[PDB]
Write a protein that binds this ligand. Structure first.
Ligand SMILES: *C/C=C/[C@H]1O[C@@H](n2cnc3c(N)ncnc32)[C@H](O)[C@@H]1O
Ligand SMILES: *C/C=C/[C@H]1O[C@@H](n2cnc3c(N)ncnc32)[C@H](O)[C@@H]1O
Ligand SMILES: *C/C=C/[C@H]1O[C@@H](n2cnc3c(N)ncnc32)[C@H](O)[C@@H]1O
Ligand SMILES: *C/C=C/[C@H]1O[C@@H](n2cnc3c(N)ncnc32)[C@H](O)[C@@H]1O
Ligand SMILES: *N1CCC[C@H]1C(N)=O
Ligand SMILES: *N1CCC[C@H]1C(N)=O
Ligand SMILES: *N1CCC[C@H]1C(N)=O
Ligand SMILES: *N1CCC[C@H]1C(N)=O
Lengths: 344, 8, 343, 12, 343, 12, 344, 11
C-alpha cells in the first residue's frame, strides 16, 4: 500500500521497472548529449544552490545526476531508485569514492524513508510528451522531503501544442489499414475488419520528428510549476487552446513537445525538445485528428486537449478541435502508452 | 512495445 | 489454477496477449507470405487429412488457419484464441458465411472446454528460435482433445545449431558494452560496471539474418516430435553438440534456426527458417560468446546447449562450448525473452 | 532499439 | 664524468651508436630527399654564413653536412661522430680530396677535445617527435665551442600538437591488447593481465603519417631557440595547451610534428615534418588516449604535455587532457623510446 | 613488428 | 659472478630481457599456433611424464608451458623467468588458482636457487637458426636440477643445412649497395664506400621463407642431444657438410632450419620449422656466399659451417664451401645477431 | 626491414 501502488497496475509497474533495469537503457539516456550535458550545465553553473547543501535525486538510475550534484559541492545526496539499477548505482558510488556524500536508497520514492529534509530535489521525470510514465507525480510527491525554502531542478515544465499539416502521415494510416480491404486474402474476405484496423491506427500517437514547416500556428503553452503543483494537478490535465492560424491548409492533428527550466540562484538553464532544437531521445509527439480541418490563415482553431491519467503509468488523450469561422469539427481519442515509433 | 523511453 | 497459470507470471501473460490483440500484429504475421503461403500449401495439398474431419486450431488469432481447414473440407473447426483477437476472428467467420463450420472458443487452450475430440490439431506455436513463447507446451497440451491416431499440423520441429564467425557483429555488441569502460564520462568513472554491461549485452540473442558463409560446421539437429512429446519434455531441453570444424578461424557463437514439417497423408510440406531459405519474420537467432574461441579446420567443438523454461513464457539459455584439441572453453547465459532485433 | 521487451514476434 | 655518460645508461648508448654504425642506416637517412635536399639548400643558400668560417658538425655520420659546408666555402670543418661511422666519413673525406678542410674527430661531442672555437654549428639532432634521442642536449652542449657571434643550423625548433580522431587506429591497438582478455587461451585464463596489456600497448607512441582531415583543432606550438637554450632546459619540458575544437567527435589522442628553421644571414630555410608537407623519415607521432574524449565544436580541450628526460636517451611523456565543458578527463603515460612503427 | 627497441630513426 | 654474466655483455643482456618484458612479445609467440599447439600436444599426450612429477620451466615467460604441465597433472612446477614478465606470470598463477602447484622464481636460471631436484625440464630455448640467443646453454645449465634419469622437453634438436639457388636475393645485395656507387650524390662522390656497403649486407643472415624448389641438395643434419650435451659443447659448433648436388646451377648460399623432438614415455612429438612445414615465427635462415659456386648435378659441395658463440647472446658464422670437381671456392662471415628480415 | 633488438621475428 502506497501512493504509487494505489495508482498503478502491478503488471504495468513490473514491465516499467524491468525496462529501467538495463544498463543499455541508462546508456541510451546518458548518450543523449543534449539531455546529459544540459543537466550538468544547470547543476554546475548554479553551484551555489548545491554547495554544502542536502540533495534528493528522484529516480537516479545509474546515479549520474547525483554525481553532477557532487561535482557542484553537495554535502550529502540521497539517490532514490526503484529499479534494479539502484544496485549498479551503489557500485559507481563506491568506485568513485563518494560513499560519504551519496547514499543510494533502493525503492520507490513514495515508499522509502529519508532521514532528513533536503534543500533541493533533482530528477529527470519527463517521459515523451512530458507526462508519459506519470513520473512527474513522483517528483511532486517527493516534495514532502523538501524544506519550505527548498528548490527543485527542473523547476517548471512547459508542454507545447501546435496544429500541423502532414497529408502523407494521414493517408499512411489508411494505406496500412487497407490491407484488410481485400475480398480474397488466400481465399478469405478480410474487409469486415478494415474499420477496426483504421480505428486502431488512429489511437496511436506518433513518436518521431518533423520539419517545423508543417506547423501552422504559434504553439500554446501549458506550464507546470513544480514548486507550486500537487500530485492531484496531473490526474486530469485540461489544456485549452485557441490557435491563430499562420498558414492556410488542412490541419491533420496536434504536435507536442516540452521544455523544462532549471531556475537557479545564478542563472536559468533550459532543456528543450522543440522541433526547432537539436533532436533528443524524447523526439516529438503528434496526435492525428480523425478528420482534417480546413483552416484559412487568420482563422482560429479552438478546442481542448484533455489528458486523463490511467493506472498504466500513462494517459488517455482526448482532443477536440474546431475552426471557429466555419464550425467544422473533429476529435480523436488516443492511448499514450502504446505509440507508434515512426522515426527511421 | 514496452519501450518506455524512445531510443536516442 | 490452470496449467498455463501455474507456469506463467501474470505480468508476462498480460503483455503477451496484449501484443496479439493488435490487428497490426496479425497483419504483420499474415503478410509473411512464406509463413502464410506455406501453411495454406500444407493444409490444402493434404486436403484428405481435413475432409469431413473435426479440427482444433490452437492460437487461431484472426482465424486464418481455420479458414484454410474450411477450404480443405473440414466438417467443424474449433478455433481457440486467448487474446482479444478472438472477437475479430468471429467477425471474419460471419462475414465469410462459415458460422456452420468455424466455432471460435475464446480463451486459453488449457482452460476452455470442447464438446468433442478432434481428428487433427493445427497451430503456429513457433516463436523465434522455435522455443520462445513456450506455446509448444500449449500445442502439446491440446493433445488431450486429440483422438487416438490423430494428426498434428505441424507434426515435428527441428532445431538447428551451427557455429559461426562474425567479427562485425561481435565488435558491434562489444563496442556498445565498452561505453561502460569510460573512466571519465562527464567526470564520472563508469569502468566498475564494464563487466556487468558485457554480461547484459551478450545475454541478448541477436535476431536477424546472415549469409550462410559465416557458418563453420555442419549443423546439429534436435527434433521435437509433437505427436509423441509431453509438455513436460520442454521444461528442460538439453542439446549436446559435437561440431567438426570445416574452416579455421574464430567461433563467435552459435547460430539457430528451425524447420517444421507438416506430415500429411498426401505429402510432407516443410516450413523452414534456415538462412538458405527465403527470409521469414522469424529470421534467425545467434548467441554470442563474450570471448570467441579459436578453432582449426579438423578440430571438434563440443558442449551442450541447455534451455531452461522460465515463468516469462521464454527460456534461459545456457551454452557451454569447448575446443577439444586445446581445451579452450566458453560459457554464456542468454535471456531469450529480451533479444536484440538487428535487422 | 536495444530493448523491445514487449515484441513477442519479430516484424516481418 | 662526461656530461653524456652522467645522463645516459651504458646499455642504451651501446645500442644507440650500434644502430648508427650501419651504412644501411646512413643510406636510409640520406635517401630522404626532403631532409638531405633541405639541409643542402639551407647551407648553400646561406653560403656567406660559411665562407671562410670555422664549422662544427655534431653527429656528422658519413659527413654529408660537412661536405655541404665545404661546398659553401668553409675554411675548416670539425666533424664529430661517436659511432663507427666516423671511420667511413674519414674515407669519404680522402676520396673527395677534402683532407685540407674536413677534419673528422671521432667520439662524443661531450668528450672530444676540439682544437678551436667555431663560427657556426651544424647538426641533425632531431629524433622522431623532435625530442627522442636527447641529441638536442648534445647540440646545445656543443655551444661551449661556439664563438659569441656564432650561429646554429638549425637555429630553432617548433613542436606542434593537435588533437585527432582516428577510430581505426584506436581499435587496431585496443584489439591487440584484448588478446589478454581471453578467459581460456588454450584453457588458460589471461584476463587478469588485460589491464596491464592496455597500459603497455597505449604506452607506445604511434609513428606513421595520416590525413590532415583527422585533426580537430588548430595546433599549439612550443618553440626551442637553440641559440639561447641551455642543456638543462630539455630535462623537463612542459607544454600546456588549450584547443578550441573545430569539429565534433571523439578525440582519440594528440598528434605531434616538428619544424626547424635555419635562420641564416641571407634567408631562413624551413624543414617541416608537418602532415601538410611532403613525408620524411620522421613521419609524425600520435599519442593515444586509453579512452577517447567526446568534444563538441566550440568546446575547449585543455591540459598539459609533460616530457621528462630519462637515462635511455628519450623521454617519459605525460599527457593529461580535459574537455572543460564536461570535465571529461584523460591521462596517459607513454614511453617515447619504444614506439609502434606503423608505416 | 610491435617492438623495435633498437630502431632509433624510422625507415624512410 | 654467474655462468650467465661471464658469457654475456651487460648491454646485450639489458636489451635482451627488456624485449621479453613486453606482453606484446609473449603474445607474438603465443599466437604462433604451430608453436603453442605443438608444445601443448607434446605435454598432454605424454601426460605420464608429468602426472605427479616435479617440473622446472626455464624461461617460462608468461607461464603458458607451466600451465600445460599443470593441465597434465604435475605435482609442482618451478617456473624460472629473468625478465620482468615473471611478475605477470605470478598474476596469472594467482588468477588461475594454481599458487599451490606453480611457483614463479624471478631470475636467471644460472643464478636462482631451487629447493629440490625435478623430474623433467621444459623450455622453449630455440632462437632463429636454433642457436641464436644462446639460451640452449641455459637449458643445458639447468640440468644441475634434474634428477638422474630425468627427461627434457624438448629432448633433442636438429639443425638442417642445405644449399640453395636464389639469383634475385644475391643480386639484391648489390642493388642496395650500389647506392654508394655514384660520383655526385648532392655533390659528393660516395663510390669509395661501395665495397664496405656490400660487405655489410653480406654479413646479414636473411630471415624469411622460400619455395623448397630452390634447394639444390638433400639437407645435412647436426643434432644436439639436450640430455647429453654440455654448455661448453655450444661455444664452438662445427658442422661439416658434403652435399651431393641434385640440380645444376649457381649455389648462392646455405639455408637453415631446425626441428626439436619431445621424446616422451608415450610418444615422440616433433616441432619442425622446415620449409616443407607450416610457417612459424622462426621462419628459416639463409646465409649467402660472397661469390656463387657453379655446380652440376652429381658434383659434391663440401666445406664447413662454423658457429662461434659471442658475448652478444648469438654467434659469428663462418661458412666456407668448394665444388670438389672444380676447386671453385667461396666463403662468408655473418653476424647472426643482426639479421635482415625479408619476409613480406 | 632490419630487426635491431627484436630477438624473435614477428609471427
Ligand atoms: C524517466 C526516468 C525514470 C527513472 O526514474 C525511476 N523511477 C520512476 N518512477 C520512480 C519512483 N516512483 N520511485 C523511484 N524511482 C522511480 C525509473 O526506474 C528510472 O530510473
Ligand atoms: C505465435 C502465435 C501465437 C498465437 O497463439 C495465441 N496463444 C498463445 N498462447 C495461447 C494459449 N495458451 N491459448 C490460446 N491461444 C494462445 C496468441 O495469442 C497468438 O494469437
Ligand atoms: C639523429 C642523428 C644522429 C647522429 O648523431 C650521432 N650522435 C648522437 N649523439 C652524439 C653525440 N653525443 N656525440 C656525437 N655524435 C652523436 C649519431 O651517432 C648519428 O650519427
Ligand atoms: C626464446 C624464449 C626465451 C624466454 O626465456 C627467457 N630467458 C632467457 N634466458 C634466460 C635465463 N638465463 N634465465 C631465465 N629466463 C631466461 C626470456 O626472458 C624469455 O622469456
Ligand atoms: N536518437 C535521438 C535523436 C536521434 C537519435 C540519434 N541519432 O542519436
Ligand atoms: N520481414 C520478414 C522478412 C524481412 C522483413 C520484410 N521486409 O518483409
Ligand atoms: N620513408 C620516408 C617517406 C616514406 C618512406 C619511403 N617510402 O621513402
Ligand atoms: N608470423 C609467423 C608466420 C608468418 C607470420 C604470420 N602470418 O602469422
Amino acid at each position: 500500500r502506497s501512493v504509487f501502488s494505489e495508482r498503478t497496475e502491478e503488471s504495468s509497474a513490473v514491465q516499467y521497472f524491468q525496462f529501467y533495469g538495463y544498463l543499455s537503457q541508462q546508456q541510451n539516456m546518458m548518450q543523449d548529449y543534449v539531455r546529459t550535458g544540459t543537466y550538468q550545465r544547470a547543476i554546475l553553473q548554479n553551484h551555489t544552490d548545491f554547495k554544502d547543501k542536502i540533495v534528493l535525486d528522484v529516480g537516479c538510475g545509474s546515479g549520474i545526476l547525483s554525481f553532477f550534484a557532487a561535482q557542484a559541492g553537495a554535502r550529502k545526496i540521497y539517490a532514490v531508485e526503484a529499479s534494479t539499477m539502484a544496485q549498479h548505482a551503489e557500485v559507481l558510488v563506491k568506485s568513485n569514492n563518494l560513499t560519504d556524500r551519496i547514499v543510494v536508497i533502493p525503492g520507490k520514492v513514495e515508499e522509502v524513508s529519508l532521514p532528513e529534509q533536503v534543500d533541493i530535489i533533482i530528477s529527470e521525470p519527463m517521459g515523451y510528451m512530458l507526462f508519459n510514465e506519470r513520473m512527474l507525480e513522483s517528483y511532486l510527491h517527493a516534495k514532502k522531503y523538501l524544506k519550505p525554502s527548498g528548490n527543485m531542478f527542473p523547476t517548471i515544465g512547459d508542454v507545447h501544442l501546435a496544429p500541423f499539416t502532414d497529408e502523407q502521415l494521414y493517408m499512411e494510416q489508411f494505406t496500412k489499414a487497407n490491407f484488410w480491404y481485400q475480398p480474397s486474402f488466400h481465399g478469405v474476405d478480410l474487409s469486415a475488419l478494415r474499420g477496426a484496423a483504421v480505428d486502431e491506427y488512429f489511437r496511436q500517437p506518433v513518436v518521431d520528428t518533423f520539419d517545423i514547416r508543417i506547423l501552422m500556428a504559434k504553439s500554446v503553452k501549458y506550464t507546470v510549476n513544480f514548486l507550486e503543483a500537487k500530485e492531484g494537478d496531473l490526474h486530469r490535465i485540461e489544456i485549452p487552446f485557441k490557435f491563430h492560424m499562420l498558414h492556410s491548409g488542412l490541419v491533420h492533428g496536434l504536435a507536442f513537445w516540452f521544455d523544462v527550466a532549471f531556475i537557479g540562484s545564478i542563472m536559468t538553464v533550459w532543456l528543450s525538445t522543440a522541433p526547432t532544437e537539436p533532436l533528443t531521445h524524447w523526439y516529438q509527439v503528434r496526435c492525428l485528428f480523425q478528420s482534417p480541418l480546413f483552416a484559412k490563415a487568420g482563422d482560429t482553431l479552438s478546442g481542448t486537449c484533455l489528458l486523463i491519467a490511467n493506472k498504466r503509468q500513462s494517459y488517455d488523450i482526448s482532443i477536440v478541435a474546431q475552426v471557429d469561422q466555419t464550425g467544422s469539427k473533429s476529435s480523436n481519442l488516443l492511448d499514450l502508452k502504446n505509440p507508434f515509433f515512426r522515426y527511421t | 512495445p514496452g519501450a518506455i523511453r524512445p531510443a536516442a
